[PDB]
């Protein structure tokens, strides 16, 4: 038996956590917070024919910059061709990495209610010398039947690599909506 | 008598539906998802004197592109002069249309707590040949006393026309914050 006051308390705490980037964890991969993509060491951006800006000025693609951007309506993803691809992000701050968060559009928002283009198995690599060969921080697999946002728990790093090894079966590309990196700053 | 666990379950389901574009329906009119406006076949954009960018470079208006954009803070609307006006959007995908969704700023956010500039009676038209004279998919009237977001239930189409026949009484213009089109893709 729960009282009214305890219902108001439970929703107020739940809207606070919602308002706190949905999962209440600082994101050191968040561009506005001062992170950037090593655009040279990212997978080739699948750009193809699609979006023209007019008056035909210009063909529109999605830079990998967006995987570090919060807006995750459908289409606001970075897309590479095939089921393998990678990105190297310089975190806003040298931290000891404790978790990553991946997120895809909800099925209810995506047509035919399937999210074929989402990443399946991925892996995370630290790069001690920003310079070096990656140190495997951990492998995980994003769960197409899971929630849109899923966070995954595992030395300080400022450069990290999200490596996607498989996708959930799209024959042409893989979309990455948002990638996050959590952890504690050094002492 | 409800238990704690059932309160947590009910709010978790409610925040999921909230996070899912508020109503959990794919939007084939959503630009980022690959929809566009037939800018030639849209009502004349009421632009008047208002917003200058400096150093006076430039006068700022709101393209009809925004009615297919999610941001719905006050002012992020497309505005035409008078109480009649129309827009033709090419849906991201040929679908059999089953519903549309209109949405206006909440009264609590709008000054003097009234939303005089909102659309009243509207209508929806398919255009089989993207080319053709519209096929009336259904008439509805947006309810100024309703909720900000209101969705309305009714052949495949990719081109659809939102036709506004009256507004809720603004003497100068009508603002359109967001227009959505739901349905099922063809087989």
């Amino acid at each position: 038996g729960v009282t009214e006051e305890q219902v108001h308390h439970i929703v107020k705490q739940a809207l606070q956590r919602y308002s706190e980037d949905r999962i209440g964890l600082a994101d050191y991969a968040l561009e506005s917070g001062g992170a950037s993509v090593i655009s040279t060491r990212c997978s080739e951006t699948y750009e193809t024919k699609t979006a023209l800006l007019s008056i035909p000025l210009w063909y529109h693609s999605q830079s990998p910059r967006v995987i570090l951007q919060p807006d995750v309506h459908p289409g606001n993803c970075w897309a590479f061709q095939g089921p393998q691809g990678f990105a190297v992000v310089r975190l806003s701050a040298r931290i000891r990495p404790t978790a990553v968060t991946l997120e895809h559009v909800p099925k209810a928002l995506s047509p035919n209610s399937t999210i074929s283009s989402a990443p399946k198995d991925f892996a995370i690599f630290g790069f001690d010398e920003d310079l070096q060969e990656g140190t495997l921080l951990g492998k995980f697999t994003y769960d197409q039947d899971g929630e849109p946002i899923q966070t995954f728990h595992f030395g300080t790093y400022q450069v990290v690599e999200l490596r996607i090894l498989t996708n959930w079966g799209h024959p042409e590309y893989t979309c990455i909506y948002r990638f996050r990196v959590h952890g504690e700053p050094a002492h | 008598g409800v238990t704690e666990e059932q309160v947590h379950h009910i709010v978790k389901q409610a925040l999921q539906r909230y996070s899912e574009d508020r109503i959990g329906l794919a939007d084939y009119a959503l630009e980022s998802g690959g929809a566009s406006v037939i800018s030639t076949r849209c009502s004349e954009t009421y632009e008047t004197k208002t917003a200058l960018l400096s150093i006076p470079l430039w006068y700022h208006s709101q393209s009809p592109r925004v009615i297919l954009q999610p941001d719905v803070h006050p002012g992020n609307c497309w505005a035409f002069q008078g109480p009649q006006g129309f827009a033709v959007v090419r849906l991201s995908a040929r679908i059999r249309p089953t519903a549309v969704t209109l949405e206006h700023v909440p009264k609590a956010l709008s000054p003097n707590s009234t939303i005089s500039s909102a659309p009243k009676d509207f209508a929806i038209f398919g255009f089989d040949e993207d080319l053709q004279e519209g096929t009336l998919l259904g008439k509805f009237t947006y309810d100024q006393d309703g909720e900000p977001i209101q969705t309305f239930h009714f052949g495949t189409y990719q081109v659809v026309e939102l036709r506004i026949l009256t507004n809720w009484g603004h003497p100068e213009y009508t603002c359109i914050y967001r227009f959505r089109v739901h349905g099922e893709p063809a087989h």
Partner: peptide, 15 residues
Amino acid sequence: TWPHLQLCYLQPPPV
């Protein structure tokens, strides 16, 4: 004086 950049889709974008 009033501006507008046009967006159109020749194929469905990555989604």
